[PDB]
Amino acid sequence: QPSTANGGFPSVVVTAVTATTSISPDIESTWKGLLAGESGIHALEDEFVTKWDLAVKIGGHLKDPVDSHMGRLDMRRMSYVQRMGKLLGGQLWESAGSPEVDPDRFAVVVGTGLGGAERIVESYDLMNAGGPRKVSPLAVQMIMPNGAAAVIGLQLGARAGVMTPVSACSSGSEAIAHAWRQIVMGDADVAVCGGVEGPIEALPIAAFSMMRAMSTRNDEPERASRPFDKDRDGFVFGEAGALMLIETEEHAKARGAKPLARLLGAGITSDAFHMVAPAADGVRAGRAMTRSLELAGLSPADIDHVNAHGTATPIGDAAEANAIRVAGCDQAAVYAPKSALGHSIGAVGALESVLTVLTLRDGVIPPTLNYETPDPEIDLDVVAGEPRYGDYRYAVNNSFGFGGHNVALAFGRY
Template sequence: MSASDVVVTGLGATTPLGGGVEETWDGFLAGRSGVSALEAEWVERFDLPVKIAAQLAVDPTEVLPRVEARRLDRSEQVALIAARQAWQDAGFGDDGVEPERLGVVVGTGIGGATTLLHQDDLLEQNGLRKVSPLTVPMLMPNGPAAHIGLEFSARAGVHAPVSACASGAEGLAWAWRLLQSGEADVVIAGGAEACIAAITMAGFAQSRTMSTRNDEPERASRPWDVDRDGFVLGEGAGIVVLEREEFARARGARVYARLAGVGMTADAHHITAPDPEGTWQAKAMEAAMRSGGIDPAAVGHVNAHATSTQVGDVTETVAVRKAIGDHPVLTAPKSALGHLLGAAGAVESIITILAIHHGVIPPTANVDELDPGVSLDVVTDEPRKMDLEVAINDSFGFGGHNVALAFSSA
């Protein structure tokens, strides 16, 4: 089967800004923050220096039936919620695509660590009989992808890329490859993460990568601002339905945008720090444009990974200038969402898709004074209306993973 254009027909999300895509998008445009003070007892018990996080606006237990929720890790819960939204948004009912032509690629950075910790506590305190027989299916990193595959009877392959904070974007990239190769007609793709827990908070705090602006939670995540002091941990899921264009057109599907090209590289530089030259981040963007036949001059917008760390934020802008030039307009969703780790690249791809679809770029919050090392146009304060032909979403992860996704107008 010959290569095909890949189109986006369905969107689903549950995030710190809302329980769905529309609420999340509206929250961005309104400049709301999803970051708040943590009230869990372990914050004080362990005297954590970081006492804030970007928690879900709508708890999964408010959406899922009680029995179903109890059988799923929180990362699996959010993945299913977002997948069901995306499938419905794409206009599929109980049928519409043969199972052997439907695939799933949903990544996660950490997976079911909270299940692992909880079940280990039960084992230590109460013995073997209290450990759930569902422990392994709940803790395995492929759990979110597997449950979505079961839900929709996907038999063209169910995959779970694990590449830290680039996992969700890799989900879309590998889905694009499945569709381009003709191995599937439809792929449910994205990422999920829900691991706001004592051990993750403590680990990130010890590495001094998280903001300690505890007295101003909503102002803590501040990409590119001179006073940024680290990221804010978040949770959520983003799922998109991708289709071969001819398949989508044949069934009369609404198309949000095209996933025109993808690029994936690795820094091979350091386990957590990016290559300060931004060379391989730039090459990922170049690969995305090359695979989509895109002229860099056509790229009007970059939805940046920008986590609010001192080194990473500026390095990315260096990479953008290398790969594309000085003309793209930038925004950073983590200023409102926090950092959703394995879900970040998927949720931020949805924001990129909607920016193209609606012709408006959401603002970056909390930029009081732009870092002088950032010599690019950053949208702040108010949304900016802009007709976009092409926009790129960047996602990078510990381990040196770089993923760039190039979206174009429908």
């Protein structure tokens, strides 16, 4: 049976990364802030918080708003996720040295949680006011959830496939998983992959906080996101978008690209348990970790680091603890970046994949914020207090999205 280790799969490496987060618009500045213990979660200063008197008053808006880089033309012909996709796609290409690859071997896989949904209401209102002819001829290409990926493929010239997987919190990781599949199966040699997601606003907060899924610790914004802590009470929103450039090792060496890490394998399973809650069991989530090891050619003992899903919901963190143990990776050093960066749904899997690559490159894991009283039935090696420097050789990033979608990406240090 083929794997990355035995040569059945071509070696795929990560050569460029880009992200915009609640800490910084530059991924390297975000990484530095994460190591200094910074948090992007603050008190929400928007008027919709006091307009509706929401139970959740905290969150992390993007440090540098997307639309501050958007002129009038872009503001009326693209949805938000498309504008974020265009800005990130442009920054990623420049960071990669603006290489000139074969368009017929160039794929794009960008996940998202919803799509250009705000343009649905705009066309809804424009039609109620002026009739059917007041709807823009660009409404279709702005509304369609594949729009962000289509914009990036069109901007970069990717003709080996433009794909948009949708699986809530795992969209961004699943996009990287399919991009890896697209390369190891021979359909592409280079791929841009990641996830984009819209901003924080009233209705998203209302919908998620009625599931009792969000933290209500509005008095201390940066202490609210407490993954694996006893005092956790749900997740906190943190806006993000992230893309990475993956390609075969042959393709990277032929253009003089210094790879940051190795993309080894990817496992996609499902719970078939509940529409929003994860299986407390954790077998299928752990099976996704195991599956990524089989395709990578590794064993659970090789896994030094787990970038956990860690939303800080009571049920989710417990389910992941069982998942990590089921996969046999309970001895690894665990990091929950949502402690500092919050949850960005369709983008967070991509963002945490970048953080996983950065952890392998620099041999350091940022501290899990607010990890003060470890929950007794969650016995994990949670990095806390200060960054832990270590010989991290192989790492697994976890994404367990609403709907029961489990994605596990296996990364190795180059």
